[PDB]
Design an enzyme around this catalytic site. Structure first.
Site, PDB file in Angstrom:
ATOM      1  N   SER A 182       0.832  -1.195   0.000  1.00 54.98           N
ATOM      2  CA  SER A 182       0.000   0.000   0.000  1.00 54.98           C
ATOM      3  C   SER A 182       0.870   1.249   0.000  1.00 54.98           C
ATOM      4  O   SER A 182       1.830   1.354   0.769  1.00 54.98           O
ATOM      5  CB  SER A 182      -0.924  -0.005   1.217  1.00 54.98           C
ATOM      6  N   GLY A 183       0.529   2.199  -0.868  1.00 57.03           N
ATOM      7  CA  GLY A 183       1.332   3.385  -1.065  1.00 57.03           C
ATOM      8  C   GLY A 183       2.404   3.251  -2.124  1.00 57.03           C
ATOM      9  O   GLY A 183       3.156   4.208  -2.341  1.00 57.03           O
ATOM     10  N   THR A 198      -2.290   3.300  -8.019  1.00 53.50           N
ATOM     11  CA  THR A 198      -3.292   4.167  -8.625  1.00 53.50           C
ATOM     12  C   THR A 198      -2.655   5.055  -9.677  1.00 53.50           C
ATOM     13  O   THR A 198      -3.153   5.165 -10.795  1.00 53.50           O
ATOM     14  CB  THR A 198      -3.981   5.052  -7.572  1.00 53.50           C
ATOM     15  N   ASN A 234       0.279   3.040   5.838  1.00 53.55           N
ATOM     16  CA  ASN A 234      -0.076   3.997   4.800  1.00 53.55           C
ATOM     17  C   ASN A 234      -1.305   4.781   5.231  1.00 53.55           C
ATOM     18  O   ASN A 234      -2.111   4.312   6.039  1.00 53.55           O
ATOM     19  CB  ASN A 234      -0.344   3.302   3.460  1.00 53.55           C
ATOM     20  N   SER A 269      -4.581   3.821   2.001  1.00 53.19           N
ATOM     21  CA  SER A 269      -4.645   2.446   1.523  1.00 53.19           C
ATOM     22  C   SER A 269      -5.960   2.196   0.799  1.00 53.19           C
ATOM     23  O   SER A 269      -7.021   2.646   1.242  1.00 53.19           O
ATOM     24  CB  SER A 269      -4.502   1.478   2.693  1.00 53.19           C
ATOM     25  N   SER A 270      -5.891   1.473  -0.317  1.00 56.57           N
ATOM     26  CA  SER A 270      -7.077   1.071  -1.070  1.00 56.57           C
ATOM     27  C   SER A 270      -7.396  -0.372  -0.704  1.00 56.57           C
ATOM     28  O   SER A 270      -6.781  -1.307  -1.223  1.00 56.57           O
ATOM     29  CB  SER A 270      -6.846   1.232  -2.568  1.00 56.57           C
ATOM     30  N   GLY A 296      -1.144  -5.316  -1.672  1.00 57.67           N
ATOM     31  CA  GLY A 296      -0.014  -6.215  -1.649  1.00 57.67           C
ATOM     32  C   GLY A 296      -0.129  -7.289  -0.583  1.00 57.67           C
ATOM     33  O   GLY A 296      -1.157  -7.472   0.072  1.00 57.67           O
ATOM     34  N   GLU A 302       0.668  -7.781   2.519  1.00 64.00           N
ATOM     35  CA  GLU A 302       1.054  -7.052   3.719  1.00 64.00           C
ATOM     36  C   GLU A 302       1.342  -8.005   4.869  1.00 64.00           C
ATOM     37  O   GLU A 302       0.608  -8.969   5.101  1.00 64.00           O
ATOM     38  CB  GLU A 302      -0.040  -6.066   4.129  1.00 64.00           C
TER      39      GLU A 302
HETATM   40  N1  LIG Z   1       5.011   8.515 -11.275  1.00 64.11           N
HETATM   41  C1  LIG Z   1       5.068   9.053 -10.034  1.00 64.11           C
HETATM   42  N2  LIG Z   1       5.825  10.141  -9.785  1.00 64.11           N
HETATM   43  C2  LIG Z   1       5.902  10.695  -8.561  1.00 64.11           C
HETATM   44  N3  LIG Z   1       5.237  10.216  -7.496  1.00 64.11           N
HETATM   45  C3  LIG Z   1       4.442   9.128  -7.600  1.00 64.11           C
HETATM   46  C4  LIG Z   1       4.308   8.472  -8.905  1.00 64.11           C
HETATM   47  N4  LIG Z   1       3.472   7.435  -8.727  1.00 64.11           N
HETATM   48  C5  LIG Z   1       3.096   7.427  -7.422  1.00 64.11           C
HETATM   49  N5  LIG Z   1       3.675   8.441  -6.756  1.00 64.11           N
HETATM   50  C6  LIG Z   1       3.502   8.740  -5.315  1.00 64.11           C
HETATM   51  O1  LIG Z   1       2.601   7.800  -4.726  1.00 64.11           O
HETATM   52  C7  LIG Z   1       1.644   8.460  -3.895  1.00 64.11           C
HETATM   53  C8  LIG Z   1       0.245   7.936  -4.190  1.00 64.11           C
HETATM   54  O2  LIG Z   1       0.207   6.525  -3.999  1.00 64.11           O
HETATM   55  P1  LIG Z   1      -1.143   5.706  -4.299  1.00 64.11           P
HETATM   56  O3  LIG Z   1      -1.194   5.373  -5.770  1.00 64.11           O
HETATM   57  O4  LIG Z   1      -2.295   6.434  -3.650  1.00 64.11           O
HETATM   58  O5  LIG Z   1      -0.904   4.344  -3.481  1.00 64.11           O
HETATM   59  P2  LIG Z   1      -2.076   3.247  -3.409  1.00 64.11           P
HETATM   60  O6  LIG Z   1      -2.174   2.748  -4.830  1.00 64.11           O
HETATM   61  O7  LIG Z   1      -1.566   2.235  -2.413  1.00 64.11           O
HETATM   62  O8  LIG Z   1      -3.277   4.032  -2.941  1.00 64.11           O
HETATM   63  C9  LIG Z   1       1.746   9.953  -4.163  1.00 64.11           C
HETATM   64  O9  LIG Z   1       1.994  10.664  -2.947  1.00 64.11           O
HETATM   65  C10 LIG Z   1       2.894  10.121  -5.139  1.00 64.11           C
HETATM   66  O10 LIG Z   1       3.872  11.037  -4.636  1.00 64.11           O
HETATM   67 MG   LIG Z   2      -4.533   3.464  -4.487  1.00 64.06          MG
END
Ligand SMILES: Nc1ncnc2c1ncn2[C@@H]1O[C@H](COP(=O)(O)OP(=O)(O)O)[C@@H](O)[C@H]1O
Ligand SMILES: [Mg+2]
Lengths: 146, 740
Positions: free
Chosen positions: B176-177, B181, B216, B219-220, B442, B444
């Site tokens: 997660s994180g 997304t 995180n 987290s989704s 993931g 976890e």
């Molecule tokens: N291509 C990228 N460039 C810079 N930062 C990224 C990139 N992809 C993800 N991040 C970082 O990941 C974080 C968002 O994660 P997120 O996709 O919400 O995680 P999850 O999928 O677990 O929810 C943001 O704070 C961002 O800074």
């Molecule tokens: Mg997400």
């Protein structure tokens, strides 16, 4: 004994002092002009692997040179057309029978043993086409024919 | 040239001079190894001297510690480091992957290939690699020539769909994180070149389907599956979205260091006073049981801004405003349910309500009758044979029923919302050969793993089994094409043990569900029965471990990542799902959107099986995302964390499975025309040279179109070719000296 006679005649011909004495720096050249193609390892081990200061200091006579050529004549490692062509083909990216001159220069300067520019330039003098490439087949014919 | 990309070219791939200078990095393989450390537990060092069993080594950071010689493994040669794809790593080791990843990330390198996977790390800054010029450059580029990038695998999937006329799926799973997304958003715009609607809706789904974890903040929990319906000519036609494995336990229950979903706290923000006024909300989170037990609030998120973002997403979108008001009304009603008290009728087991004012608010919110709802909850009626009969319920049963009802209505809300945005986004163009893009949480492994973690681990185990089966099928097909088979044993049973312990009858979930219906079942009895039926009998099951003072553990499992210990307390309260039916009828007799609206482990199993049967119909594609560090500093990365995530994601096991067979396959003609330099004297000569190589013939296998052999033989062949060509160069120098 006639071959020894020719060896000593060449030795005295190459002797600029008349004492049948030569330096270590030119012993390899004499051996190669007499029909050998040894590496630096072979010419150093026959002299006992001397240091740089001893390389340019000591002198060797024909009598002390006789064992060197006698032992070198027992070595039959001189290469062949097939090995050289196979080695030079890997540099033929386009595979038409030619090798880049600049790439050859860089690999000679970096890979293997570096050599003085003038001798290699003379060796390739006229061996490169109008495109700056060298037909390695004709180059192989030229280098080993002499 | 590599210069097509331009600005992003240095990031996508390094130039020749850097590779040359790094190649000549002078290091002796006999003196530099990897030594375990104390706080990173994996470091590199060079042996100062060898003293028998114990060897003293100097590390890069600077230390004079010594270790037994058995704990040091070989180190990759400097001539082979910083490889774009690590599938053919000369020395595969657990810390070697970490070292390569950190070395690349230091050169600000993100995407890396690991065979069938595509490992990507998460930086924190804008990058130019997503330039549309880069997208055009990757158009039609294969996995081999192009530098590692998600666009390469996307184009490979597109080409597979074009040439095979079958559905393709791309799966993303990371801690997660890890930025799943964001990666999905990038790939969906890559496909676009409607996506604007996807991004516009994304905040709403994230807010309604995320919560703060101890690791995180966003987290989704649930999984997403976005299907891009294409046309017969491979042109974007429409988009659909499907959601699986929503965590009702989150809504009903929260942990000590955990928050509920973002929506409840957002409306708890007072920067939208009208909603609070019309929801009869006191703006005090501690007044609602369903939320208070978790974490009140965190400073990482400002709440109100997220609320305005979600409100903007709702307002400018397919649905109207009164529907949004109804959704807020129902969410507030759910919040209200955590305040009823009830009481067991004196001299009776039936329970009657006491605080008949929260019920009034809830009934007004749904437009129901408070008295009718109370009577239905207290005395539910069921039809036996052909006649209706009332039932008796005690306080515990009614509490479980109301919790189940609240969580069920929340799940139905989520599903209805997904359907609504899907209908708005969908358009009547022809749909053909949809491409699936799945993302899921993931593997976890926290310090207090519990039932929710168990469900996520089971889902990840199923995904890993699917991956292994796909690899086995691909390898078997390749062998059949080549006419020779090797290691004709499937890898499913190499992983089936955990699944058997988890799902099959008399398994953990089956036993728990058995406890659910037992008259008097407690956690102690659950543990006793688990030990009686599985302790010793099953290899995977084993006793818990107490290391460095963990809070507590009850039992442990051996997953594909490592030994993981769980806990028992609270599982029974978190698995009961009594869904009352009379109140369902009351909802269906309501003047509101509820008309359209109408055990946890069993429903989760059914959803997971639906997901797997949907996925099996599509050709998979795998991606891996790993966070570099806990702190948002981009450059630095923690070695233990990266290694733990690498173990969890199973990159090492996948590459090992690939290596089990004969991964190195080279065209016979190409090998004959290229590697003949080793033994200079296109099939007879190839086999002649191979036989005359003076190497044991058990290592390599003789084919007809592609020669096969193990990496050990390939490395030996390459090094002996290198020394042979060095000898040839020396002979050339000797000849040139002869010319002199
Ligand atoms: N291509 C990228 N460039 C810079 N930062 C990224 C990139 N992809 C993800 N991040 C970082 O990941 C974080 C968002 O994660 P997120 O996709 O919400 O995680 P999850 O999928 O677990 O929810 C943001 O704070 C961002 O800074
Ligand atoms: Mg997400």
């Amino acid at each position: 004994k006639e071959q020894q006679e020719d060896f000593k005649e060449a030795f005295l011909l190459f002797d600029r002092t008349g004492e049948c004495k030569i330096t270590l720096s030119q012993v390899g050249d004499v051996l190669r002009a007499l029909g050998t193609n040894p590496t630096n390892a072979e010419v150093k081990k026959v002299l006992g692997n001397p240091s740089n200061e001893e390389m340019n200091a000591k002198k060797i006579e024909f009598e002390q040179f006789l064992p060197m050529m006698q032992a070198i004549s027992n070595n039959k490692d001189q290469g062949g057309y097939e090995d050289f062509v196979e080695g030079l083909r890997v540099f033929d990216k386009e595979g038409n029978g030619t090798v880049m001159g600049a790439e050859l220069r860089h690999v000679l300067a970096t890979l293997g043993e570096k050599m003085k520019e003038e001798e290699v330039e003379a060796l390739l003098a006229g061996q490169e086409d109008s495109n700056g490439c060298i037909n390695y087949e004709a180059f192989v014919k030229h280098i080993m024919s002499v | 040239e590599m210069a097509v990309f331009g600005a992003a070219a240095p990031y996508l791939r390094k130039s020749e001079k850097e590779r040359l200078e790094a190649q000549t990095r002078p290091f002796d393989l006999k003196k530099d190894v990897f030594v375990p450390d104390d706080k990173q537990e994996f470091v590199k060092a060079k042996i100062v001297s060898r003293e028998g069993g114990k060897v003293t080594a100097e590390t890069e950071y600077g230390k004079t510690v010594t270790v037994k010689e058995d704990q040091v493994m070989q180190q990759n040669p400097p001539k082979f480091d910083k490889i774009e794809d690590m599938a053919m790593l000369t020395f595969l080791h657990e810390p070697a992957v970490l070292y390569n990843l950190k070395d690349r990330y230091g050169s600000w390198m993100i995407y890396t290939y690991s065979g069938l996977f595509c490992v990507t790390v998460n930086p924190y800054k804008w990058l130019p690699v997503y330039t549309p010029e880069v997208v055009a450059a990757y158009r039609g580029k294969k996995r081999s020539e192009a530098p590692p990038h998600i666009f390469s695998i996307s184009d490979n999937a597109y080409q597979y769909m074009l040439t095979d006329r079958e559905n393709q799926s791309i799966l993303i799973t990371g801690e997660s994180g890890a930025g799943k997304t964001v990666n999905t958003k990038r790939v969906i715009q890559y496909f676009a070149v409607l996506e604007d609607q996807i991004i516009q809706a994304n905040p709403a789904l994230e807010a309604f389907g995320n919560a703060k974890t101890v690791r995180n903040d966003n987290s989704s929990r649930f999984g997403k599956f976005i299907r891009i319906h294409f046309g017969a000519t491979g042109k974007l036609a429409s988009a659909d979205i499907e959601t699986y494995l929503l965590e009702k336990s989150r809504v009903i229950f929260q942990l000590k260091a955990e928050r509920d979903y973002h929506i409840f706290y957002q409306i708890l923000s007072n920067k939208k006073p009208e909603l609070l006024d019309m929801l009869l909300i006191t703006n005090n989170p501690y007044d609602y049981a369903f939320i208070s037990q978790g974490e009140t609030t965190v400073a990482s998120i400002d709440d109100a801004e997220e609320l305005m973002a979600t409100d903007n997403a709702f307002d400018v979108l397919g649905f109207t405003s009164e529907e949004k008001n109804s959704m807020y009304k129902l969410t507030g009603a759910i919040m209200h349910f955590g305040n009823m008290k009830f009481k067991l009728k004196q001299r009776e087991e039936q329970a009657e309500p006491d605080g008949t004012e929260e019920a009034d608010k809830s009934a007004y919110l749904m437009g129901l009758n408070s008295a009718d709802l109370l009577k239905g909850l207290c005395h539910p009626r069921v039809k036996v044979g052909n006649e209706y009969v009332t039932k008796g319920q005690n306080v515990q049963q009614v509490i479980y029923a109301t919790g189940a009802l609240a969580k069920a209505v929340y799940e139905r809300m989520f599903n209805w919302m997904v359907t609504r945005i899907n209908a708005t986004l969908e358009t009547k163009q022809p749909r053909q050969y949809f491409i699936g893009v799945l993302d899921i949480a993931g593997f976890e492994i926290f310090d207090f793993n519990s039932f929710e973690q168990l469900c996520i681990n089971f889902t990840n185990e199923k995904l890993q089994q699917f991956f292994n089966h796909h690899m086995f099928v691909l390898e078997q097909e390749e062998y059949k094409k080549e006419g020779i088979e090797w290691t004709f044993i499937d890898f499913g049973m190499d992983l089936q043990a955990c699944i058997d312990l988890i799902e099959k009858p008399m398994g953990i979930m089956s036993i728990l569900e058995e406890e659910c219906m037992f008259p008097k079942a407690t956690d102690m009895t659950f543990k006793a029965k688990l030990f009686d039926n599985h302790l010793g009998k099953s290899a995977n099951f084993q006793k818990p471990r107490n290391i460095k003072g963990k809070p507590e553990a009850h039992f442990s499992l051996i997953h594909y990542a490592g030994i993981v210990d769980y806990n028992i307390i609270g599982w029974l309260q978190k698995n009961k799902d009594p869904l009352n039916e009379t109140v369902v009828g009351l909802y269906q007799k309501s003047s509101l959107k509820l008309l359209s609206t109408l055990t946890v482990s069993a429903l989760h199993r059914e959803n997971l099986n639906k997901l797997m049967t949907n996925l099996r119909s599509t050709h998979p594609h795998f991606v891996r995302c790993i966070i570099p560090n806990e702190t948002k500093s981009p450059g630095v990365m923690d070695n233990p964390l990266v290694m733990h995530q690498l173990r969890c994601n199973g990159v090492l096991e996948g590459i090992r499975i690939c290596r089990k067979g004969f991964p190195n396959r080279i065209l016979y003609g190409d090998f004959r025309q290229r590697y003949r330099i080793l033994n200079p004297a296109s099939r007879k000569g190839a086999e002649k040279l191979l036989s005359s190589l003076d190497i044991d013939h058990n290592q390599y296998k003789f084919g007809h179109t592609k020669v096969f052999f193990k990496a050990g033989l390939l490395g030996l062949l390459e090094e002996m070719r290198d020394e042979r060509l060095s000898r040839i160069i020396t002979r050339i120098q000797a000849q040139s000296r002869g010319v002199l």
